[PDB]
From a paper:
Brain butyrylcholinesterase (BChE) is an attractive target for drugs designed for the treatment of Alzheimer’s disease (AD) in its advanced stages. In the case of BChE, the active site is buried at the bottom of a deep aromatic gorge, at the entrance of which there is a peripheral binding site (main contributors, Asp70, Ala277). The active site features a choline-binding pocket (main contributor, Trp82) and an acyl binding pocket (main contributors, Trp231, Leu286, Phe329, Phe398), which accommodate the choline and butyrate moieties, respectively, of the substrate butyrylcholine (or its analogue, butyryl thiocholine). The catalytic activity features residues Ser198, His438, and Glu325.
For the design of probe 2C, a more conventional approach was therefore adopted, based on the crystal structure of inhibitor 2 in complex with huBChE. As the naphthalene and 2-(dimethylamino)ethyl moieties form crucial interactions with the active site, the indene group was replaced by a 7-(diethylamino)-3-(thiazol-2-yl)-coumarin moiety. Indeed, the indene only has non-specific interacts with the protein scaffold, and it is furthermore oriented out of the aromatic gorge, towards the bulk, which suggests more permissivity in terms of fluorescent group substitutions. Unsurprisingly, compound 2C showed lower huBChE potency when compared to parent inhibitor 2, which is known to be one of the best reversible inhibitors of huBChE. However, compound 2C maintained good affinity, with an IC50 of 88 nM. The piperidine moiety interacts slightly deeper in the active-site gorge, stacking between Phe329 and Tyr332, while the dimethylamine moiety engages in cation-π interactions with Trp82. While the thiazole ring is positioned close to the parental indene moiety, no clear electron density is seen for the fluorescent coumarin-derivative moiety, which indicates that it does not interact with the protein scaffold and is likely to be free to adopt a variety of conformations, all of which will be characterised by the coumarin exposed to the bulk. Probe 2C showed relatively strong emission in the buffer, and the addition of huBChE induced an approximately two-fold enhancement of its fluorescence intensity. Improvements to the ratio of the fluorescence intensities between the bound and unbound probe might be obtained by the introduction of a more environment-sensitive fluorophore that can interact with the protein scaffold, in place of the 7-(diethylamino)-3-(thiazol-2-yl)-coumarin here, which does not. Most notably, the emission of probe 2C is significantly enhanced upon binding to the active site, and thus can be used as a tool to study the activity of BChE.
Numbering used by the authors: 4 to 529
Amino acid sequence: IIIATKNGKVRGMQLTVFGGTVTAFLGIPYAQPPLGRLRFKKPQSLTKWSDIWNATKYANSCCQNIDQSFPGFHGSEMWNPNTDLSEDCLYLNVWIPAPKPKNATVLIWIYGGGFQTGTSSLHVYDGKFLARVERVIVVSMNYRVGALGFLALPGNPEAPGNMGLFDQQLALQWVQKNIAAFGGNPKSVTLFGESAGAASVSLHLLSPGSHSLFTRAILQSGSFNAPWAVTSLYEARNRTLNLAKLTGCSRENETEIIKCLRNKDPQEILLNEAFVVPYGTPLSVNFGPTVDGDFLTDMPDILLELGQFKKTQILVGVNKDEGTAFLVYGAPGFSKDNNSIITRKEFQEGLKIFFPGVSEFGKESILFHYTDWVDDQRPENYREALGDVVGDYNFICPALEFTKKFSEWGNNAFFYYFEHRSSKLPWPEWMGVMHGYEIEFVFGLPLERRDQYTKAEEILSRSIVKRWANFAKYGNPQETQNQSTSWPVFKSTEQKYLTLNTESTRIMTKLRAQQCRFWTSFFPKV
Ligand SMILES: *[C@@H]1O[C@H](CO[C@@H]2O[C@@H](C)[C@@H](O)[C@@H](O)[C@@H]2O)[C@@H](O[C@@H]2O[C@H](CO)[C@@H](O)[C@H](O)[C@H]2NC(C)=O)[C@H](O)[C@H]1NC(C)=O
Ligand SMILES: *[C@@H]1O[C@H](CO[C@@H]2O[C@@H](C)[C@@H](O)[C@@H](O)[C@@H]2O)[C@@H](O[C@@H]2O[C@H](CO)[C@@H](O)[C@H](O)[C@H]2NC(C)=O)[C@H](O)[C@H]1NC(C)=O
Ligand SMILES: *[C@@H]1O[C@H](CO[C@@H]2O[C@@H](C)[C@@H](O)[C@@H](O)[C@@H]2O)[C@@H](O)[C@H](O)[C@H]1NC(C)=O
Ligand SMILES: *[C@@H]1O[C@H](CO)[C@@H](O)[C@H](O)[C@H]1NC(C)=O
Ligand SMILES: *[C@@H]1O[C@H](CO)[C@@H](O)[C@H](O)[C@H]1NC(C)=O
Ligand SMILES: *[C@@H]1O[C@H](CO)[C@@H](O)[C@H](O)[C@H]1NC(C)=O
């Protein structure tokens, strides 16, 4: 219950899970607190300690604006930090099965949230069920989000960009140096993540500094080639300057700007992040990954296109209704509290909200491609169309394109389409299988017969958990014991994918083929 790590001993705590025991180490530091002269810098190496570090509580979450759009509503508030905000947030968590394993595969979770929010302490990222049920080790880290994590003056070590990515990288390396002491196999490390975390995972596939830090990869609802995932070096600079002016820190010595931004206080930086883009959307990523020339040596689309990435197996997937969650955060006529039937002209107005800098002709080409109703009468037609637009453009099509390009270089890839709507889903039914609501199934929360999930959800979560684990341990996401549908590899020819739900597990082909041809080939031209 005490473990010696390369920088000191840490005390853990024991959890009882399903008539058994998991050992939890919550809040292990892994970097020097990035405070004072360290803010905006790459994380620094943690200096040794002689005590027992008490790893018994989740540590501070990184500073972030929180979602206040639905005060008191669990659908939104379940994603807000459940631990004090602080700049002193570079901690990680380890769940180890009991008894202590001897060469366990390690699952490293990277949370998502548009690169501006999120924290490893969330209830639906609790790693104890995976450790209990499949006897893997689960690791998760906090990493700096927003401008504190991704503010970029490229080339300038005072604000080089991609600090949050380097936080993640530092944690991956902590797993390399220390997880063997916990009973884990550092040669069997699977990164998994969702949304911006999935996109983070995919950039770890392109980053040479990360190639030796993990074995395999799982990408849930995200990848770097998503339109939100990489800030241009153009946007990045115009955005730090806009931050600087809104903080009265505009100097000409760009390091003087950073030193000036360093003595502003977190909430003053946080309050101004929102306005560095002239027009934002519910998908805005004001401060995200950039081609820093360090973590990321070239535009990632080129590296993807030209085969420059770690060669290994990947597991990629998306949910049936990725886009709906964003509609009630700005789109006219939408509300979580009715069925949000919108008209044609509301739909068009919605496009102007989601595609502000897109020409009139671009916005018409979207309307044209999505408004060809099989049934002209359905009053939901435009409501569903807008969600499909938002989901295909932002998630499903970039994910498919990522998997095609990655598998063309010879590696086994598996693709899933999650289409089960949680029976506990607090959001209205019309929003469907929403962005982020497969995470609870992946982490095995429906395995706890106490918390209001159906039988069928237990069965499906149990199968997903087995498949994620077999992918991590063995590179192959099969459930071999219970006469399950075999999960085929995804090849750029047949493009077979696996659907996940309670009813039927079907092999299908060429997900959203007609919609993605518009987004991936035509639309980038406009
Ligand atoms: C590049 O920077 C300028 C400055 O942004 C403005 O000031 C910031 C501090 C912030 O408050 C933003 O909301 C502002 O927009 C941007 O130029 C402005 O453009 C918008 C309309 O596009 C408008 O507010 C003003 O006409 C412009 N202001 C100035 C001083 O020129 C510009 O949009 C930024 N981005 C790009 C891609 O050019
Ligand atoms: C669904 O609800 C939306 C959201 O607006 C409502 O306004 C509050 C007063 C309350 O009634 C809540 O349920 C919502 O927050 C409706 O959009 C509104 O529509 C009316 C009439 O068109 C208009 O006055 C408002 O500007 C709209 N608000 C917006 C666009 O934010 C919508 O009409 C409702 N749809 C259905 C089918 O009931
Ligand atoms: C670290 O914790 C030591 C023992 O704490 C034990 O665990 C917690 C959960 C409580 O149940 C406590 O009563 C247990 O004994 C302390 O003795 C020690 O002082 C702590 N160290 C620091 C630096 O806080
Ligand atoms: C763990 O497995 C690796 C190969 O994945 C092996 O080289 C190593 O010796 C093993 N360590 C143990 C069993 O302690
Ligand atoms: C001002 O900028 C120069 C480079 O133009 C840099 O060398 C110097 O360190 C900056 N001033 C301070 C006080 O850092
Ligand atoms: C396989 O089926 C058994 C019932 O025979 C069930 O208890 C078990 O949880 C299932 N395992 C998986 C991985 O689905």
